Amino acid sequence: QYSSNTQQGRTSIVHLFEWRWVDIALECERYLAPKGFGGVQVSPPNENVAIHNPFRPWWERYQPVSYKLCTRSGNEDEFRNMVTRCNNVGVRIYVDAVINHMCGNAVSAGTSSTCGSYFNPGSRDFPAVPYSGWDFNDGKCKTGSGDIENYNDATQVRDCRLSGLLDLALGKDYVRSKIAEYMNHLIDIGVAGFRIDASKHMWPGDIKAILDKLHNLNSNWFPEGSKPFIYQEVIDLGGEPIKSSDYFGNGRVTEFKYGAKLGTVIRKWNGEKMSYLKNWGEGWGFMPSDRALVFVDNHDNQRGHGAGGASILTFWDARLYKMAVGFMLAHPYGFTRVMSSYRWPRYFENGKDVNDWVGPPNDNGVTKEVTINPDTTCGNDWVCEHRWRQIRNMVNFRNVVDGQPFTNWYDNGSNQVAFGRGNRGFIVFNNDDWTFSLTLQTGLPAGTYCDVISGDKINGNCTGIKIYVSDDGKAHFSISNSAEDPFIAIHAESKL
Ligand SMILES: C[C@H]1O[C@H](O[C@H]2[C@H](O)[C@@H](O)[C@@H](O)O[C@@H]2CO)[C@H](O)[C@@H](O)[C@@H]1N[C@H]1C=C(CO)[C@@H](O[C@H]2O[C@H](CO)[C@@H](O[C@H]3O[C@H](C)[C@@H](N[C@H]4C=C(CO)[C@@H](O)[C@H](O)[C@H]4O)[C@H](O)[C@H]3O)[C@H](O)[C@H]2O)[C@H](O)[C@H]1O
Ligand SMILES: C[C@H]1O[C@H](O[C@H]2[C@H](O)[C@@H](O)[C@@H](O[C@H]3[C@H](O)[C@@H](O)[C@H](O)O[C@@H]3CO)O[C@@H]2CO)[C@H](O)[C@@H](O)[C@@H]1N
Ligand SMILES: [Ca+2]
Ligand SMILES: [Cl-]
């Protein structure tokens, strides 16, 4: 469960949050494959409650109605078409598996669902599965409300309803088997693994029992005996009885400390400085690099959900965001996930975004296609961070330097830093309030290199900045503090 199952030489996944299956299929072919992306995390592909108050929020997809592959992203045929087309060009699909719970206990009975299946939260009847009252934790939970009230009690975190979401009885073989049937359906289609939603809300042993039932990956695309890549969503910032390490037996775990701390560093908050990143990784108290699933923001915290945090960087703070993402993709720690978002009309009333619920760009609830602008950006309010030159090119940097050691670190004791990855890549940052101008040892072969942040290598020249590495590996770098992108990155494949 620890190996990504990506193609050799591809090292990141991108979250195409709320994208339609047909758009992802094209994106794999026209962009992700040629640009060297490892894979795509998809939004939950199973039927959910259609919520009209408020109007079709992104979070309705975290309220399952059945395991039918029928959502605003598309139907089963469209989902199958996407997985096949993506695998065929060497780009993997990872499914956001919502398996802790069905929908909210207070949702009205009927057929207000993305495939029109009947369901009755009140009587606990989900006949499309099927589940009944016997399949939920109502009698196991010991809180007065039946909901999670207190994270200091590890038992209720697992047995009670997360924000009222009907809590599946994951200790029952029947429940485990219905979940496994869903996941095996997905695996056999050709899915490479899973983001396990709400893992903290499940016993590690119950997840293990589900995982025991899972097939090996599809033998047309994957070597025999390949196991689904598992990364579990556990928000562990310290101070709670449940630890991310509790989940290491099942696969990787999201490291939410990563983006929280990096955000603070890059904003220069709380006295933090880029020079402190010399021991980034386990040195900062993070989990082992071989288990960490790392990211600057996720779909929750970019809009203040989950642990939130003021320090979280997103596309809304585009300048600092690119630097954070660039740092992450350069550094060997963890397995990297890049966010890809849509814009919503963010509106703050007393420090909180009252539109933090708004779903994907839509016309009357129908998800807008991702249109591709002439400059390769996206239209229809899709942000497409993964198509931003600075991030896209750093995705390739990580590929180029895969497995090379962290070396040749430099810092000015404040916010001007640089480091190399073996003899394959080198990156320089200026986050101070003055110019960085210095000659540095790069660790690279002599030559002319295109800076992949300001531009591209195209048939014998560069469209951005050029760096000249002399015979002894030294190169001069000048980065103004007023620079729109105050960082430079060069690597073996950007050499002329
Ligand atoms: C969002 C994450 O919450 C949890 O995280 C905890 C940390 O674990 C903890 O250490 C500390 O930092 O606080 C955090 C925030 O509380 C959780 O551990 C983590 O897994 C969550 N991320 C996940 C999981 C889910 C659930 O699948 C996703 O959640 C999102 O979707 C939810 C469901 O649609 C959405 O909730 C909405 O719907 C519920 C039903 C509603 N609840 C109300 C209803 C009733 C009726 O009984 C009352 O009981 C409640 O009090 C009402 O508020 C919510 O109000 C409504 O928003 C949720 O907001 C949304 O984040 C998430 O996307 C995953 O990534
Ligand atoms: C294990 C520890 O990791 C993190 O601590 C950071 C800290 O947030 C950061 O400011 C910095 O602290 C030192 C640094 O170690 C030292 O080399 C430098 O001279 O001075 C810095 C402070 O002025 O780095 C450490 C990691 O080395 C977490 O933030 C913390 O919660 C956790 N206990
Ligand atoms: Ca649970
Ligand atoms: Cl996540």
Instruction: Clarify whether residues 347 and 420 are in a common domain.
Output: no
Q: According to the annotation, is 161 in a ligand binding site?
A: no
Please state, in angstroms and rounded to a whole number, the distance separating the CA atoms of residues 17 and 25.
Answer: 14
Q: Quick one: how far is CA 71 from the chain centroid?
A: 20
Spatial distance between the Cα atoms of 398 and 491, rounded to a whole number of angstroms: 9
Q: How far apart are CA 242 and CA 406, in angstroms?
A: 32
Instruction: Quote the number of domains for the chain.
Output: 2
Ligand 1 geometric centre to CA of 161 (Å): 10
Same domain, yes or no, for 317 and 447? no
> What count of Cα atoms within 13 Å lies in the side-chain half-sphere of residue 185?
18
Specify the CATH number for the domain of residue 429: 2.60.40.1180
Q: Are residues 462 and 477 in the same domain?
A: yes
Q: Say whether both 350 and 294 belong to one domain.
A: yes
Contact 92, 5 (CB under 8 A): yes
The reported resolution of this PDB entry, expressed in Å, is 2.0
Could you say which of 355, 371, 403 is where a domain stops? 403
What CA–CA distance (Å, rounded) separates 138 from 161?
9
Last residue of a domain, one of 350, 377, 403: 403
CB 283 less than 6 A from any atom of ligand 2: yes
CA distance 259 to 211: 28
CB–CB of 35/396 below 8 Å? yes
Q: Both tokens of residue 65? A: 């109605």
Is the bond preceding residue 54 a cis peptide, omega within 30 degrees?
yes
DSSP annotation string for 132-144: -GGGBSTTT--SS
Question: Which H or E run contains 324?
Answer: helix 318-330
320 and 428 in a single domain? The answer is no
Which two tokens mark 425?
A: 């890549």
Question: What's the CATH number where 120 sits?
Answer: 3.20.20.80
Structural domain of 417: 404-496
Cis peptide before 130 (omega within 30 of 0): yes
Say yes or no: 184 and 212 in one domain.
yes
Whether residues 217 and 94 share a domain: the answer is: yes
Give start and end residues of each alpha helix (H) in 354-471: 389-400
User: 30: which DSSP letter?
Assistant: I
Annotated catalytic residue within 135, 206, 233, 300: 233
Q: Are residues 28 and 86 in contact, defined by beta-carbon separation less than 8 angstroms?
A: yes
DSSP class of 250: T
In ligand 1, the atom with minimum distance to the C-alpha of 201 is 18
418 and 335 both lie in a single domain: no
Active site residue 197: yes
Amino acid sitting at position 93 = I
- Please give the C-alpha separations between residue 97 and each of 41, 51, 180, 317, 447, in angstroms, as whole numbers: 10, 20, 11, 30, 47
Task: Note whether 379 and 446 are same-domain residues.
Answer: no
Identify whether residues 106 and 192 lie together within a single domain.
yes
Pick from 403, 423, 441: which residue ends a domain?
A: 403
393 and 419, same domain (yes or no) = no
Q: Tell me which ligand sits closest to the C-alpha of residue 258.
A: 2
